[PDB]
Every structure is written in C-alpha cells, then in structure tokens.
C-alpha cells in the first residue's frame, strides 16, 4: 500500500501557472506510473497527465499536451503537476494516482484503473 | 613498449594427470611469438583472459583490480599479498585514481620472473623460476587458485620493477607430457603450416614428406536474396480506407486471399491509435504466410 | 524474482539429500534433464545452480530445454544440452491477491534472444520502429517490460507458479556437492566395484608412483578412460588396473 | 598440403594450396595448385618430395626448398 | 486393471513414468504394450463434503 497525499491548489488567474504536488509514502519502490486526473463539478473524472517511475517518459491528454508538464522526483518520492496557461476549463478538484502495474505501453495508463488514490486538491481559475 | 612471448604462457588446462602422451587441446592460451606489452599503473582491457607476468628484484608489485569501472556502484575484484598473506575479496569498493562494501566473498592465505594467467568464474594460475627481456625458454603454470565468484570482468590494473601483458586467445595446443606427468613442450596448431602439420600427425618430429593438413575455402562476403517483383497488393485499401463502416451487431467481414499482405504500411503507419496483436509480432507477418485473413 | 531478473543461488561443499525434493508431495513439476532424480543421490557435483523465478502455469512448458516463446526467448534460455532439474509448483496462495498482483514482470521485447543462462535486467526503451526513442516512449517506443495479472480467481494456465531450476556442474573438478550416500572403507590389491564421488567402475587399486601435482585430482588413460584417482577422504593417489581378464 | 623436408633438417617448409589460383589466398602456379614457398628452378632432378603433375620438391642449397 | 485416480495423475498411467503413482501404486513396465483407458468420474466419485 502506498499513501498519496496532494498539495498546492488554489486560486489563480487566466494565463497563469501553478504546480501541484503529490507524495508518496509507504511501498514507494512498487511505484510503476503516477496519474493525474481531474473531476469537474457535474462532470466524470478525466484523466490529465502519466509518467512512467523509470525513465520519466510521459503521457498527456489532449486537452492539456503543450500547457501541462507532469515531472517526478525519484529521490523524495514526489510528482509535480506544472499547470502553464490556464483556462477556465481547467477549474476541478485535481487526484494523483499509483500504480505498480508495468505496461509496455505508456498510453494504457490513460485508462488503467490504478491503486492508491490522493484526497484531491481543488484548482480554481479567474477569468481574464 | 613490446617484446617477444617465446613460448611463455602454457598452463595445464585441466586437473588431469597425463604421462608420457601428446595431449590436443582447445583453450585460451598465450598465442606463441605474439606482442607482449611492455611496462615499468594504467588501466588495461582483459579481453578473455590475461597473461601477465613480472620481473622483480625487490618484490614492487602486490597485488591485481579487475572489474568494469573499478570504482564504487559495481562489484570489483582485488588480489593482494603483503609478505605474509594474501588477500581476496569482491566488495564493490571506492577505489583511488591512482590506488597503491556489500562483500559477497573473501579469502586470506631482474631476478624473480613470477608469471600469472588469470580467466575467467576466476581461475589464477602461476609459476615462479629464478631468471638472469622476458627470456626464451619453456615452463608451465600449474593452477594456484579458483575463486566462484562470477564477477563480471572487461578492464583490470596493478598495484605495486617491469612486468608484461598479453590477452590469451583460444587457440588449440599440442602438449608434451612427461613420464613425470610435467608438461615439456608444446605447439601452437595455428602459429606457422609446420604446426598445423605438426598438430595433424600428432608429433613434435614431422619426417621429410608433403601432409594435407587442413581445408582452403573461399568464404562469402556478402547475402544475396532474390524474389519476383511485388504484385498484386492486398486491398488493406478497400477496408481501412473504406467511405462507411458497419454497425457492431452487423461488423462486416471481408476475406483476403491470393495477394501479398503489406503490413509495414500499416504498423509504420501514424494514423492508429490501437494496434494491438496478441500471439504475433506485425512484424513478423512479413515473413508469413497465411490460407486467409480475415478483416 | 521476476522471470527477466531471476534469482540465482550457488550450492556448493555440503551435502544435498534430493529425497527431501523427490519424496515431497508440494511439487506439480519434478522434470529432470541428463539425470534420474533418484540417481541425485549418487552424484557428486562441483557446484549446483538454483536459478528461482516466478511465471504463469501456461508458460512452464518454456522452462525445458530448447524451448521457444516470451519467456524462452527473452527472459530465461536453457540450453539445448542442459543437465539438471525443473521444479515448479502453484504459488496461488502467496503470489496472487484480490486486485492482482503485478509485483511480478516479464520481459515482452528483445532486440535478440537470449543465450542459455542469460540475465537482461535492462530497461531500456525499446525501438519498435525506424525512430530512434532516446529514452522516450511513444508511437514504436515501448517498456520492455509488463506486468503479470494475478489473481485469485485466475485460470490454472494464468495462475502463478514458483519456478527453480538446479543445473549440476559436471567438470573435471573436485566435486563439493555430494549426495547422502555414506562411504566405506577402501580395500586394495582387489577386484573391487569402486565408486569415487560418483565415478564409478570395477578395477584393481594399488599404491602408486604416479608424481600427481597438489591440485590433481585423478589421471587417464590414452584411451581417455581413468587410469589412477585421489581418494576424496585421504590425499593418497591410487592406480586402477582393469580386472584380470583373458580370451579362453 | 604442406611441404617439408624432416624437422631433422629444417624447420622452414612450404605450402601446397590445390587446384585453387594464386589470386584467391615467392609464388609458383602448377597444374597441382598454388604453391608458396619454394623456388622455381629451371634445373630437373630426381624426384624427392612428390607435389603432382610432374612436379617434385626438395631442400637444396644458402639452402631453401626448390620444385 | 481398474481403479481410480484424480485427473493430473492419469499421466503417471503410462510407461517409463514416475510420481506417488507409478512409484508406490501402479507401476507399467517400459515395454508395455496394450490400452490406458480414463474417463472422468466427477457425477459418480464425487460428492458434497
Ligand atoms: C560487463 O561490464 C561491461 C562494462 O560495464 C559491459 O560492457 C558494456 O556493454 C554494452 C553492450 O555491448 C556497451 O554498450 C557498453 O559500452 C559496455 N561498457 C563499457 C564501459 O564499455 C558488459 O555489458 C557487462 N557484461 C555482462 C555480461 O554483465
Ligand atoms: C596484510 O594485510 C591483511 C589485511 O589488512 C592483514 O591480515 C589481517 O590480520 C589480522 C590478524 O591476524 C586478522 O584479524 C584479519 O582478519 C586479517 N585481514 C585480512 C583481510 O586478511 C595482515 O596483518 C597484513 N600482513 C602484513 C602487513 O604482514
Ligand atoms: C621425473 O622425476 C624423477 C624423480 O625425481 C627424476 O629423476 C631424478 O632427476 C633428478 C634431476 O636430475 C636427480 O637429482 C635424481 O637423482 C633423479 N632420481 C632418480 C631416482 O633417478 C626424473 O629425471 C624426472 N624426469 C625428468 C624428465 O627430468
Ligand atoms: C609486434 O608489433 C610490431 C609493431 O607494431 C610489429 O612490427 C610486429 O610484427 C609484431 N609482432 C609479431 C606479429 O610477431
Ligand atoms: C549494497 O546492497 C544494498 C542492499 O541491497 C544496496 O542498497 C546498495 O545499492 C549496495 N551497494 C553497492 C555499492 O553495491
Ligand atoms: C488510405 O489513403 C491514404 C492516402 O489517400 C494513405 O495515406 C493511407 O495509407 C491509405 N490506407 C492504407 C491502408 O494504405
Ligand atoms: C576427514 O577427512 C580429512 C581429510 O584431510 C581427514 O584428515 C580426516 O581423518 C577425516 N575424518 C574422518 C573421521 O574420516
Ligand atoms: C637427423 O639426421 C642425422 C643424419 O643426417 C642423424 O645422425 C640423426 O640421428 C637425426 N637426428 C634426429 C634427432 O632425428
Ligand atoms: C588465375 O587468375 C587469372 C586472372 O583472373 C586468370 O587469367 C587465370 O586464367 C587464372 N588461372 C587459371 C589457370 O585459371
Ligand atoms: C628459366 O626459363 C624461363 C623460361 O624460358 C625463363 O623465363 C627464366 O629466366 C629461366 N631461369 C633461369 C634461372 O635461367
């Protein structure tokens, strides 16, 4: 088991950037792929961003390729969430996930149902 | 710096005792008459094996470091002998640039020409002979020491006076066996057309004749595949490209047959999201072939 | 371990009671190559090899000798000429979990295969394509690695199974994995049935004269057959004459 | 096929290769093959070391092997 | 010869085999010759506990 505990939500205007955390602690040598996905109020859970622990490779959404950076520290067992040019549509509570699942392929982890879930951390954009 | 490796560089490849015979055998040894270098520090390549040896007159070298990097992150061999003992272990060890944990063994035990062959898990043999470069003569080495320790090995150096390296081969050898089961002499089977001779009559005393001793054969320097031009193409068109597709429930099933499936336009292609193959490579299919297919 | 990092253990200068492995009942796979498991018992070896991995039941038929496939291939090779022994046995109650388990991994791509007793334990990104990946995944740019699903509930052919092979060194050596067999007392200047470290034959020993060097251990005759043995109790060298034979 | 006088005399011999060219491998092409490492000599003598098709070598004199 | 033997053992019932079986129970010589016959018994050798 692994525990998966989110940070730095807040406030921000349009344009802006900001960057979530998510440590991990417990089993931290399991650790396969970290996630993020985000659920907007009224609507389903959406997956944003995946790096793969070995190599740092990463996988993105659509909706976010060329505005998000997702990076991890191997060392202090930490995920980072670089949120660059935010839009309105990005206000949601954001979840980090874990998994010790190995795929060959990095865009399985855009569905994969993972194993450790954070608590969530709320983003809210400002208009202009 | 290089001089001459006579005959040096013989050691009795197995645990066998053997008298008054001439033995053929396939081993790394020192090929006869070969480039020995020369010094009187660095970091040297072991290729497949090392013959080195050591003119001493007051005992300068100590000891031998083998291993990939020979510092820290990796396992790595050391051999020292301090007048009294010697000493071997396989820790991965922080090394100096120029020297002079997690232990998974350890042991404790010109004038002087003191000759080692080390290979590889490790085997070290040696010999020592009182001397007047490295001279002319024949001895051998019997074994001293063989350590199970399977560390992988690709570079080595020394610790300390001249010495010489030469990188064994596997080259077979006659050799001559005593009464006294001490080998005497030896022959190199592919030094010069009088030993392969030699070899082939199992004799170190070829009588005035011609001997057919080996094969000539020319061999091919490169692959040439020929097949007929590529005709009649698989219509992967017809489907993939197809203006409307059908519902799930009533999936339309085309056949292929009697056609040349080219699958590289496909797997190469970037216009796929999936393409998933289960108990086949796409790769693979190229070389295939198959009654049906079925899309 | 995983099947692409397994384990290996090296057995050496004890004695191996093989029964304990026969006679136990918690085994489904006891195949054994180049030897009789009964036989173990005999038989002295230089050293002993068990290579411990996990993989799934349908894949087990790969653990033998040239075999082809995932696991043959990519992640453990025997040889065509391996002598030794397979053990395998369910491991459904300790390796699979409500979830799945996927501890467990498999080497899914390999630029070659394997030579017999080969160990990739590398990571790196696989180039499916003509496009060089530099360490990064994408289109033709896959992990060379996945996971194993196992679970409870799983089919026998998907379920886990713990995997050890023993490979014995038969070298010209001195012998220090010995079975249980006990010794006896030598006789000489007799027609006797001898056994030494499971080298066997019938012959007359006599004292020799042989001048062995401190490290070998027996001799030969021209004809590659064993003229004369050190005892493996006593540093004493003995000659084997064959039993006194003639036509009639 | 390798060409030699007994080690008792020489150590320094020659070499036959048959029915092959001297382009494929002090040479001498025969109706036997390449040879290599003897001496053509225009003077005949009697048969010493057979080689083939009427050709003969042996070790004479300063010495080397001649066919 | 008739008895009874659970599946994964049929196996054993065959020349030159070994296993609890062909060891302690039934053993075929190596050069056996005739017909091993074996059809599964859940319905009738089986039964609840
Ligand atoms: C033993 O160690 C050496 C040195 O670390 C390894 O050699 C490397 O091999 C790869 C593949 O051919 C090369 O890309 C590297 O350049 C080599 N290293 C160096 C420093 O040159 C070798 O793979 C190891 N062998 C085993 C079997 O473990
Ligand atoms: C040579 O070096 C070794 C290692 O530094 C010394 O051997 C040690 O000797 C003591 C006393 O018997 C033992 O407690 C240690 O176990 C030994 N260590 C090893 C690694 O063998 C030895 O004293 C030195 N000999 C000299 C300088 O003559
Ligand atoms: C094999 O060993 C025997 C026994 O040592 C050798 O015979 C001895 O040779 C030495 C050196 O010349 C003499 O000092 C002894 O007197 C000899 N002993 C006997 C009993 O004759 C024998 O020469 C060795 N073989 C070879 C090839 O040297
Ligand atoms: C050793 O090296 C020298 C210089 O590179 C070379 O001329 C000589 O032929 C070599 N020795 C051999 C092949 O015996
Ligand atoms: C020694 O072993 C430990 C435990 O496996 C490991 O953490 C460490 O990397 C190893 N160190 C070296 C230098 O081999
Ligand atoms: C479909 O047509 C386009 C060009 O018109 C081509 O790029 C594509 O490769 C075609 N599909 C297949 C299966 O070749
Ligand atoms: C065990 O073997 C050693 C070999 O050196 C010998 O000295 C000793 O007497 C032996 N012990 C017995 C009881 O056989
Ligand atoms: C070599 O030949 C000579 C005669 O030319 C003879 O006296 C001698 O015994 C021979 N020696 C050997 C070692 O064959
Ligand atoms: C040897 O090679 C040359 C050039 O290829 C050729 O003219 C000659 O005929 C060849 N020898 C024979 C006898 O075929
Ligand atoms: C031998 O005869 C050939 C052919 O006439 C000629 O080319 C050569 O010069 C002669 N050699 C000698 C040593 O006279």
Not at chain 2, 55 to 81: A, H, M, P, Y
Not at chain 3, 146 to 169: A, C, D, H, I, K
Not at chain 3, 199 to 221: A, H, I, W, Y
Request: charged fraction near 15%; aromatic fraction near 14%; include cysteine.
């Amino acid at each position: 088991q692994v525990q998966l505990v989110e940070s730095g939500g807040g406030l921000m205007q349009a344009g802006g950037s900001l960057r979530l955390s998510c440590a991990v602690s417990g089993r931290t040598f399991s650790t396969a792929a970290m996630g993020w996905f985000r659920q907007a109020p009224g609507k389903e859970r959406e997956f944003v961003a995946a790096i793969r622990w070995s190599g740092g490779s990463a996988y993105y959404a659509d909706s976010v390729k060329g505005r998000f950076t997702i990076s991890r520290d191997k060392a202090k067992n930490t995920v980072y969430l670089q949120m660059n040019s935010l839009k309105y549509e990005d206000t949601a509570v954001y979840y980090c996930a874990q998994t010790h699942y190995v795929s060959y392929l990095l865009s399985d982890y855009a569905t994969w149902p993972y194993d450790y879930w954070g608590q969530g951390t709320q983003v809210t954009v400002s208009s202009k | 710096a290089y001089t001459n490796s006579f005959t040096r560089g013989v050691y009795y490849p197995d645990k066998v005792f053997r008298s008054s015979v001439l033995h053929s055998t396939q081993d790394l040894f020192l090929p006869f008459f070969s480039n020995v270098t020369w010094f009187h520090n660095p970091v040297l390549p072991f290729n497949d094996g090392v013959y080195f040896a050591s003119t001493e007159k007051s005992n300068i070298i100590r000891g031998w470091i083998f291993g990939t990097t020979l510092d820290s992150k990796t396992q790595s061999l050391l051999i020292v002998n301090n007048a009294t003992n010697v000493v071997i272990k396989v820790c991965e060890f922080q090394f100096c640039n120029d020297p002079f944990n997690n232990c998974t063994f350890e042991y404790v035990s010109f004038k002087n020409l003191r000759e080692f062959v080390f290979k590889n898990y490790f085997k070290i043999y040696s010999k020592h002979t009182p001397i007047n470069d490295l001279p002319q003569g024949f001895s051998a080495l019997e074994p001293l020491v063989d350590l199970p320790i399977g560390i992988n090995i690709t570079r080595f150096q020394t610790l300390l006076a001249a010495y010489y390296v030469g990188y064994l081969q596997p080259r077979t050898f006659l050799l001559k066996y005593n009464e006294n089961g001490t080998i005497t002499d030896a022959v190199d089977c592919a030094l010069d057309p009088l030993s392969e001779t030699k070899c082939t009559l199992k004799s170190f005393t070829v009588e005035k004749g011609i001997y057919q001793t080996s094969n000539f054969r020319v061999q091919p320097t490169e692959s040439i595949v020929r097949f007929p031009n590529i005709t009649n193409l698989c219509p992967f068109g017809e489907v993939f490209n197809a203006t409307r597709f059908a519902s799930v429930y009533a999936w339309n099933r085309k056949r292929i047959s009697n056609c040349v499936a080219d699958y590289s336009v496909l797997y190469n292609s970037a216009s796929f999201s999936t393409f998933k193959c289960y108990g086949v490579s796409p790769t693979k299919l190229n070389d295939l072939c198959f009654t049906n297919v079925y899309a | 371990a995983s099947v692409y990092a397994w384990n290996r253990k090296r057995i050496s200068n004890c004695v191996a009671d093989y029964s304990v492995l026969y006679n136990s009942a918690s085994f489904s796979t006891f195949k054994c190559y180049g030897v009789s498991p009964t036989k173990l018992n005999d038989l002295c070896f230089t050293n002993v090899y068990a290579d411990s991995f996990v993989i799934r039941g349908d894949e087990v038929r790969q653990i033998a000798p040239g075999q082809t496939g995932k696991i043959a291939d990519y992640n453990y090779k025997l040889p065509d000429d391996f002598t030794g022994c397979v053990i395998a046995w369910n491991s459904n109650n300790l390796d699979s979990k409500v979830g799945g388990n996927y501890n467990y991994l498999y080497r899914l791509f390999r630029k070659s295969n394997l030579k017999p007793f080969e160990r990739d334990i590398s990571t790196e990104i696989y180039q499916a394509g003509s496009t060089p990946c530099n360490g990064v995944e994408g289109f033709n740019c896959y992990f060379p690695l996945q996971s194993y699903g196992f679970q409870p509930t799983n089919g026998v052919g998907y379920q886990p199974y713990r995997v050890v092979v023993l490979s014995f060194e038969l070298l010209h050596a001195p012998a220090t994995v010995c079975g249980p067999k006990k010794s006896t007392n030598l006789v000489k200047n007799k027609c006797v049935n001898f056994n030494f470290n499971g080298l066997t034959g019938t012959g007359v020993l006599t004292e020799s004269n042989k001048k062995f060097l401190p490290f070998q251990q027996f001799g030969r005759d021209i004809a590659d057959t064993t003229d004369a043995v050190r005892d493996p109790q006593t540093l004493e060298i003995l000659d084997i004459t064959p039993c006194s034979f003639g036509g009639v | 096929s390798v060409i030699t006088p007994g080690t008792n005399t020489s150590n320094q011999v020659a070499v036959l290769y048959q029915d092959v060219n001297c382009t494929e491998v002090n040479v001498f092409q025969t109706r036997a093959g390449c040879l290599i490492g003897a001496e053509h000599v225009n003077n005949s003598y009697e048969c010493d070391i057979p080689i083939g098709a009427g050709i003969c070598a042996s070790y004479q004199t300063s010495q080397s092997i001649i066919a």
